[PDB]
A paper describes a structure:
The yeast [name]:[name]:[name]:Thp1 (TREX-2) complex facilitates the repositioning and association of actively transcribing genes with nuclear pores (NPCs)—“gene gating”—that is central to integrating transcription, processing, and [name] nuclear export. [name] is the central component of TREX-2 and contains a conserved [name]/germinal center-associated nuclear protein (GANP) domain, which, along with the short N domain, binds both Mex67:Mtr2 and Thp1, a factor involved in transcription elongation. A region within the [name] C region (Sac3CID) binds [name] and the calmodulin-like protein, [name] (Fischer et al., 2004). [name] is also a component of SAGA, a large complex involved in chromatin remodeling and transcription activation.
Crystals were obtained of [name] residues 723–805 and 753–805 complexed with both [name] and [name]. The crystals obtained with Sac3723–805 had a pseudotranslation in which one half of the asymmetric unit was shifted by close to half the unit cell, which makes structure solution more difficult because this effect greatly reduces the intensity of half of the reflections and so reduces the amount of data available. Therefore, we first solved the structure of the crystals formed with Sac3753–805. Three different crystal forms of Sac3753–805 complexed with full-length [name] and [name] were obtained by vapor diffusion. The structure of each crystal form was solved using a combination of molecular replacement and SAR (Se-Met) phasing. The model based on the 2.5 Å resolution P21 native data was refined to an R factor of 18.8% (Rfree 23.5%) with excellent geometry and contained [name] residues 9–161, [name] residues 753–805 and [name] residues 6–95. The N domain (residues 18–91) had the “closed” conformation (see Yap et al., 1999) and the C-terminal domain (residues 95–158) the “open” conformation, similar to that observed for [name] bound to Sfi1 (Li et al., 2006). The [name]:[name] interaction interface involved primarily the C-terminal domain (EF hands III and IV, residues 95–158) of [name], with fewer contacts observed between [name] and the N-terminal domain of [name] than were seen with the Sfi1:[name] interaction (Li et al., 2006). [name] Trp802 appeared to be central to the interaction and becomes buried in a hydrophobic cavity in the [name] C-terminal domain formed by the side chains of Phe105, Met137, Ile138, Phe141, Ile149, and Ile157. The [name] fold was based on five α helices (helix α1 residues 8–19; helix α2 residues 21–36; helix α3 residues 38–49; helix α4 residues 58–70; and helix α5 residues 75–92), separated by flexible regions of varying size, that were arranged into an antiparallel hairpin structure that curved around the [name] helix.
Author numbering:
A (entry chain B): 752 to 805
B (entry chain A): 9 to 161
C (entry chain C): 6 to 95
The structure:
């Protein structure tokens, strides 16, 4: 009972810590992903416009 | 050094710098922390090691805040943009047009890029962009034909 | 409530935050999840009017989480649990 309360707190906090770690990792990968797409878009734009005006 | 840089940057290059900073200025406060700066530079095609990023912040850190101001980011990235290898740029752009990897930019590809950039163009005038620069007569544009377009400047 | 702050503050100073974080990332890389998040982000940008950093994240997030393998989830959960066990008084 005292041991039940300890377990439930640990189970609840394990789940919470995991959801945060995972969210932080998704956030970081996402940032990178946006950085890559931004760069790609910029290149397409530059050389598409250069082409069209050629 | 403001002035000597933005006379030799193209307007599209100045937008690129501004847009890359804004994207990761979550604060909208004109400052970026370390991870934000890292990705902002990556948005411009620059991969720096930890040591150089830290030293860049420390160099320009007018306020001990460990952040980087938009105006300093503009100066540092402006110089690096100017030192880009134009030929390496053209080649990456090529792989990006040829997104099905046939080794040639077809009308399918070019029309897809146009639609991505929100560019509103006739089918007939997309054909003309190829027709006007197709040195093979093969109806499509290979890396060389494309490098030739972009190198004319 | 506030014991959590004490545990989360001990988490970082022990270096156990970084151990767990690094294990999570190694395993996410190993199972392909980094490429999946990237595809999800790229795909969601064509389907959308918006460039908004936060908006696109909120569409990508639910879908990305479901693609995490049971094996990675269980192994990291187990690792966090064992650390909590060793810390929360008797």
């Amino acid at each position: 009972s005292e041991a039940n309360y300890r377990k439930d707190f640990i189970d609840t906090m394990t789940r919470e810590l995991y959801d945060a770690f995972l969210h932080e990792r998704l956030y970081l990968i996402y940032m990178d992903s946006r950085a890559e797409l931004k760069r790609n878009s910029t290149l397409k734009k530059k050389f598409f416009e250069k082409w069209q005006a050629s | 050094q403001s002035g000597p840089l933005n006379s030799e940057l193209l307007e599209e290059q100045k937008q690129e710098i501004y847009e890359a900073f804004s994207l990761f200025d979550m604060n909208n406060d004109g400052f970026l922390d370390y991870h934000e700066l890292k990705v902002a530079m990556k948005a411009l095609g620059f991969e720096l090691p930890k040591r150089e990023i830290l030293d860049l912040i420390d160099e320009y850190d007018s306020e001990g805040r460990h952040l980087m101001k938009y105006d300093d980011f503009y100066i540092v990235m402006g110089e690096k943009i100017l030192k880009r290898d134009p030929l390496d740029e053209i080649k990456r752009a090529f792989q990006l047009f040829d997104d099905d990897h046939t080794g040639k930019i077809s009308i399918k590809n070019l029309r897809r890029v146009a639609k991505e950039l929100g560019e509103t163009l006739t089918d007939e005038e997309l054909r003309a962009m190829i027709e006007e620069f197709d040195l093979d007569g093969d109806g499509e544009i290979n890396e060389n034909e494309f490098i030739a377009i972009c190198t004319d400047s | 409530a506030q014991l959590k702050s004490q545990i989360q503050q001990y988490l970082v100073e022990s270096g156990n935050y970084e151990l767990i974080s690094n294990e999570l990332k190694a395993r996410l890389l190993q199972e392909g999840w980094v490429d999946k998040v990237k595809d999800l982000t790229k795909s969601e940008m064509n389907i959308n009017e918006s460039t908004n950093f936060t908006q696109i994240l909120s569409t990508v997030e639910p879908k990305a989480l479901e693609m995490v393998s049971d094996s990675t989830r269980e192994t990291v959960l187990k690792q966090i649990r064992e650390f909590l066990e060793e810390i929360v008084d008797t």
